[PDB]
C-alpha cells in the first residue's frame, strides 16, 4: 500500500502473463474485451513483445496478420477472430467478405488499413533471434523467406495506391487508418463528412468503457460509420475511393512511419540477401516519404502538418503528430533543433503539470486538449515506445533513454493501461492493453 | 551464443509466459505433455508462482485442487483434466470413480495422496495479497473463509489416517505419494512387492521422454501399477490398506513437510481468527511430527531415516530426504550442526564435480547415484526452492540466499527443466515444468 | 526533475563512494563533519558496509577499533582521529589519557561504551569472505586468530562489569552509551541529574546542524557534560562509578543486542574451533541476557521496559526500544504475537501518516513524539537495518524483506541521511552518514 | 567458489570504491601503481565515471587537467602528481619545465599529447547534471563558462598545429600520443627510428608488471625514449618538430575521435549559447576530419589506414584502428556495410575462439597478433566503451547494447583490469585501472 508499484522483474512477469492471456491461439487480441480481435499495428507491437519470450510465437503473430493481407497488398486494420462478439463494427457491418474483390479467402477482415510499423517488428524479431542461436535464427530466416514478398507487396501498395501522385505522403480515407481515431488532427476534415441515410446501429465500445469522457462521441461515431457506407457503395475499390470518399487526408505521421519502415526493411533486405530490385525500391520510398514529410513542416518550428486533400489545406493542430520529422529525419539542422525544443518545452514534455516526462497526444496548452479523451490529450505508452525506439535510431541515446525511463515509471502500476491521464497518471482506456505490455517487455530487456 | 543465459527480467517474463501457457482455464498442468493434468504438490507450487502475477488466479488453482478433495479429507495426487490423453495411468486404470466411496463427484482423480505443501502456498498468497491493497486482501481472506475447513480436513486426514499409531510419521502405500517415485529410499521396500496377474498396459511417459536413462524402468512401473491393483481390490478403503498393501513405509521427508505445514497453517489460523480448537490441533501435530522426524535420526550425523513398516526396519539411504530435520527443526544443537556439515560437504552441496552449489537428489558418492535418472541423482529446482524457503524460516538467511542464487544461475538457461544433470547442468526430464517456473517467479521477486 | 531517486546500481555506487570518502586511512569517520571521528557502533556498521567492497579493509576497520580497547576490555564509544577538532566533547574534555588507568596507549578515546554490535559485523565479514575464495577466507580467518581474545574480553567486560548482579541487563552510566542520546527512554532519569559547577563549554554539534529542532537542547547537553564530570572525578574507575554516578539505568535494547551478539559470536566460535570454554561462556551470556530482556516485558503486550537503577523504577516509554525482545528471542508465544501487533499497528509501522512502512524511533502517538528531534521521533536507517537483520535471523523472512524494501525506498534519494522525518521523508541530521551508506550497501547485495 | 562474478550492484559499488581510492584529491591516478599520475585520455574517462557519483568532482577532474594545458592549447598526456615517483619517464626525463617555453607554470607535465576524448566527457557530465536538478546544472554550466575557451584552444591547437596542411588528419610525433603504445600500426614507422647516444635509464613499468609477455620490449622502450631526446633537442618547439622528428605519422583513430569530439562540442556550444564563431569552427573541423578519415579507407572494405608522413606510405595493419570511420561517420553506404562485416566477422568480434563478443586490439588472425602483449591483441574495456558510445550515437542501438553487455560480462570479475586475454578472459596489465571502472560505472546506469 505505501507504494503500489512493481519491481522490474514483477512487471516483466506480469506483462508476459498478460500477453499470453490475450493469445487466442494464433492471434493476440489488442485487449481482453474492448478490442477482442487482431488489430494490425497492435499485432506488430505484440510481435515485438513476444520476441523476448518466443521467436517462434512472435513469427506466428505476423504470419497470421499477413495471411489476412488483401490481394492488392493492403494489410487491413482488423483481422476478426472466429465467432467473437462484443466489438462494433464487426464483420457484418464491413461486408468486405461479400463486397470486396481483394479481400482474403477464409479470413474475415476490415476494409481499411493502418500504419506500417510491421518492418520494425521484423527487425526486433531478427535482433532477438540472432542472440538465441542457430535453430532460432533458422525460424526467423524462414519467416523472411516465406513473407518477404508479402511485406514488399504491403509497402508497394502504400507507395503506389495511397500515394498515387508520388507526393511522398500517404492518403487516408478514414481517421481510423491513422490509429489516432479522434485526434484533433482530423476535426476539420470530419466537419466536412455529412452522413446520408446511415443504417442504425448501437455502439459496443462504450458498453465496456462506460465513462463518456474517455471515448469518442456519438456524433463522431456516426461519421466513422458513414465513411464505411461510402466505401461499401464502391465495393472497397481503390480506383473509386478518390471519387466518392468524403474524407481524404494526407497523414504525415503515418508517412514518417512508412519512411522509417522502408529504410528498416531495406536494411533487412541487404542483410538477408533479398532481391536487389526490392532493396532499391525500399530505399527510394524511404527518401520519397522523408522528403514528403519535410515538405509539410513549419518554417520556424519544424512541426509537420497533415493535409486535407479535399479542402486543399494544411491542417495545423498541436498534437504529437507534429513530431513526425523526428522519426524519419530530413529536417535542416536548425529546424530540427527548433522541433526538439518544442518537444521538450512547456507545450509538450516540459509542461509543468505533467506527472511524467512523456509526450501527451495533444498539447496541454492547446484549446483542443482534453486530459481523458482518447487521442485528445492522454499519454499513450505505444507512442512513448515508438518515439523512444526511433530516437535511439537517430543516435539520440539519452533522449531515448529518458522516454524509456519515464515510460517504465508510468507503467510500474501494472495496469498496462491503453493510455494515462497526463496530470494525475490515472490509467484510462482498456486495462491489460497488449501493446502496453509489449512496450514494457521490449524496454525491460 | 557467447552466453545463452537470460537476464532476470527476461527470465521472470519467460517463467510467467510458461505458467500461463500451461493454464487450461482453472487448473495448470504440471508440464505441457509429460504431466498434462493437475498434480497436488505441483499445484501448490503453481499457486506460489501465480501469486506475484494474480492473487485471484492463484486462489483459483487451490480452489480447483480442493474441489477434488475426497470425502474423508484426502487430497489426491492427480486431478485429471477433462478429455485429456497422453498420460498413464489415467482415470480408467485408477477406477476411483467406480470403486472409491470417498472419491469426489464430478472430478476425476487418482486414489493416492502427496505431500502437504499446500499451507506454504497459502502463506505466500497471503503475503503477496497483503502487499497489494484492500480488494486483493479481500480475495485472499475470502479464500480462507471458504477453504479453511477443507485445509483442516486435509491435515486431519493425514494425522488421523496415515499416522494411526500417533508415531508422528506419515505412512505411504505407494512410492508415488512421496513425490520421489524412484528414489533409492524405496528400493528395498519395492523389492518386497511381487505382482500377481498384472493387467497388461503400455507406458506413456517414455513416449514423451524417450531417453531411458532419465525415467524409471519397466520393472519399476510394473510394481507401481501392481500397487494400484491392491488398492482397487479393497476399493481404496483406508481401513483395509494396512491389511493388504505390499508397500507400507513411513516417509520422513513427507513427515517433516507436514510438521512445517501444520505450524504454518496454525500461524495463519491465529492471524485470521480461525477457530482456536483448529489452531491447537495444528500446533499439536506440528510438534508430534517434528518429534517423529527427530526420532528417526542418526546419532552421529542427524540424518533422518525412512521406516519400512512391513519389514520393521530403518531404511538407510544417502538421499536429500536425509535432511528432513533441517526443514522442521527439533534436532539437538550438536546433531543439527553435524547434519548441516553433511549437507554442505563433499557428499552433497560441496561435491567437487557439481556445476552448481545445490542439493543432488541422491549423493554423488553413493553407489545408488545415477546422474540422469529422475530421483536417483539429478538436481531438482523444486527441492532447491523448498529447502531455501524452509532454511529462511529457520533463520538461516545466508544459506537460503546461497541456494536461491545457485538455483537462479542454474535456471538462467530458460529451459525450466524438471531436473538437471548435477555435473554438466544439462536440462533433463520435461522442459517447461510448471513448478520450476514457479520457483523462479517466487525467487526473482 | 520528475524523479530525483537513484537506481539500485547508482545508489550502491554512491554509497561506496561515500564510504571511501569518509576513510581517513585506517578508520572511517561516522560522518564528514558532525562526527569526524570513529564511533564504536558506527565502526561495526562501517565494517558491514565495507565487506562487499574489500574484506581486507573491513577487517582493518575492526582492527583499528579493537586497538583502542581499554585494558579491562571496554570498547570506548569514540576513537578520536589524530589532530581533528570540530567535535565536542573532544579528548581534552574527556581527559581519559591523563586520568583513566585503563585507557589505551597511543590512541585517544572517550571514557564510556556503546552497544556490542561488533560480532554481527564479524559474521557479515565471514559470510562475504566465504563467497570470495581461499585468499579472502584467509584474511578473515587471520582476523579471527588475531582478535578473538579481544572480542571475548569485550563481551566478558560487559557481562561482568556492567551486569555486576547477574541480572542479564547492561547498566549504563550515560545515555550516550545507549546510542539514543535524547531518547524519551532516559527523560525521567535525566530529570534527576542536577549539574553542579560545570566547567564552561561551547557546543560544536549545532554549529554544523544549525536547525535547533533536529538536535538535543542546551539543557540536555548540560546534563550530558555533567555526567562526564562525575566520571572524571573518580578517574573512570569501574568499581567507583556505582557510588558516584547520578545516572544509572539498565538498557534493555543494549541488553538484547548483547544477547544476539553473544549467540552470533558463539556460533562463530564453534565454526572456527575457538576454545570450548569461550563458546560455553558466550552461550551462557546469550541466555542470561535473553532472560534479562524478557523479565522487563509487559505480560500482556510484550513491550520491554528500561530500568532506573537509582530510582528502582521501571521506565515505561513508547519508543522503538520496546521491541528489544524481538531481536533476541525468548518471549512466550502469545506475548511475542502481541508485541508484533504493536510493532505493525497504528502506534508504529502502521501509523497512517508515515511515508514509509518503517519503525519510528518514538511512537507518533506518544506525547513525547517530536518528528524532527533526533531520537524523539525520526526514522533511523541504522535501526531499520538492525531490525531487518535480526528479523531475518528469527526466521521472519517477509517482515525482514519489507523493512529492507522500505528502507531502500527511503534511501533512494541518495542523501544517506542520519535520520528521516517520518511523515515527509525529509532527510535530517548529518548527510553522508556512514552507517546509512553501510546499510544500503549491505541491503543491495 | 562456484561463481566468482559480482552482481551489478556489487560491481557498481566496487567500481566507485576503486575510483575514490585512486583519487589524490583533485586528480585521479590512471592506476594505483603502474600509472600513478594523471593521464589525459584517462582523465576524460575518469570524469565520465565520476559523473553518476558527483558532478562537482567530475568537473574538478577536468579542471585539474585543463589547468595543465600548455600556453599554445596542447593538453599534455601526463600531469604528474607532486612528489610521486615509481613511473618512468618522469618529469626529470621530460625536462619540459626547464626546456618547454609553452609548458604550464605550477604543474609538471609531459611534452606530448593524447586523443581529444574530453568533449565526450563534458557531454556525459552535462547529461547527468540535467537529470539532477538546478544546483547541479549550475555546477556544470559554471564549468562551461570557465573552460569553454580552454576547450576551444585545445581543439584549435590540434586543427592548426597537428594538421598544418589541412588534410583532416592529426600528425603524431610519438606513438605514445596514439594511446596504443605498441600497436602493430606503428611498427614500420618505429623500424626507421634509429637511436643515437641515448642517456641511460632503467624501466619502472616492468618492475610493477613483471610478466614480459604483457608489456613492450626493451628495444621498443629505447625508441620511445630516443624520440624524447629528439623533442628535447628542439625544446618541444612546434615549428621545429617536423624538421627533426624520426617518427611522424597521421593517426586515423585519433583523427576520428577528434571529428566526433568537434561535433559533440559544437552541439554543446549551440545548446549553451557559446559564440557562433566557435560553433562554426567546430562544425568545420568535424567535417574536415571526417573527410580526412574517409580518405584513408580501402575502397572495398572501408578499413582505415594510418599514414607514415616520413615514408609517404599508407600503413596497412589489422588492428581495431581500422574501424575509425565507424566512430565519426562519412563512409559511403556500401563501404560502411563492408566495414561492419569486417568488424563482426571472424577476423574481429566473430572470431570463434574469443571468450566474449568484443573487439580485440589486433585481429587474432593477423601475423602481428600476440594475445597478452598490450595493444598487440588483448581486449581493452576502454575501447569497448568508446565503440559502444560512438555506435549508439550512430543510431546502432543493438550493436552498442551488445558491446556493453559483453563488456559488463567480461568486467564482472571485479578486477577492473587494464586489458583482458581475448581467448581465456584472463585479466592482464594493471588491475584497478581507473578507466575500466569508469566504463563499468557509465554502463551500469
Numbering used by the authors:
A (entry chain A), B (entry chain A), C (entry chain B), D (entry chain B): 2 to 446
Task: Kindly provide excerpts from the paper associated with this entry.
Orthorhombic crystals belonging to space group P21212 that diffracted X-rays to beyond 1.7 Å resolution at a synchrotron source were obtained. The orthorhombic crystals contained two MhGgH molecules (here termed A and B) in the asymmetric unit, which were modelled from residues Pro2 to Gly446. In the orthorhombic crystals, the MhGgH molecules adopt a closed conformation concomitant with the presence of two ligands, a molecule of glycerol and a molecule of serine, which are components of the crystallization buffer, at the active site (MhGgH–Ser–GOL). The glycerol molecule occupies subsite −1 and serine is found at subsite +1 of the active site, inducing a closed state of MhGgH that renders them inaccessible to the solvent. The substrate-interacting residues in the complexes between MhGgH variants and GG are organized in a very similar way to that of MhGgH–Ser–GOL [r.m.s.d.s of 0.19 Å (D182A) and 0.22 Å (E419A) for 14 Cα pairs]. The serine and glycerol molecules present in the active site of the MhGgH–Ser–GOL structure partially mimic the substrate, with serine superposing nicely with the glycerate moiety and with glycerol establishing contacts with Asp43, a substrate placeholder that stabilizes the sugar moiety [Fig. 4(b)]. Taken together, these results suggest that the MhGgH–Ser–GOL and variant–GG complexes are likely to reflect the substrate-binding mode of GG to wild-type MhGgH. The two structures of MhGgH, apo MhGgH and MhGgH–Ser–GOL, corresponding to its open and closed conformations, reveal the structural modifications that occur upon substrate binding. In the closed conformation, this loop interacts with the segment Ser431–Ser435 (with polar interactions between the side chain of Asn23 and Gln433 and Ser435) that contains the substrate-interacting residue Gln434, which faces the active site and binds to the substrate. Substrate binding contributes to the formation of an additional helix in this cap (residues 206–209) that is absent in the open conformation.
A glucosylglycerate hydrolase (GgH) identified in M. hassiacum and found to be highly conserved among rapidly growing mycobacteria is likely to be responsible for the rapid mobilization of GG accumulated during nitrogen starvation by hydrolysing it to glucose and glycerate. The MhGgH monomer displays an (α/α)6-barrel domain typical of glycoside hydrolase family 63 (GH63), to which MhGgH belongs. While the active site of GH63 members acting on larger substrates is located in an open, solvent-accessible cleft, those of MhGgH and of MgH from T. thermophilus are covered by a cap domain (subdivided into A′- and B′-regions) with constrained access through a narrow negatively charged tunnel. The crystallographic structure of MhGgH revealed a homotetrameric architecture, which is compatible with the oligomeric organization of the enzyme in solution as assessed by SAXS.
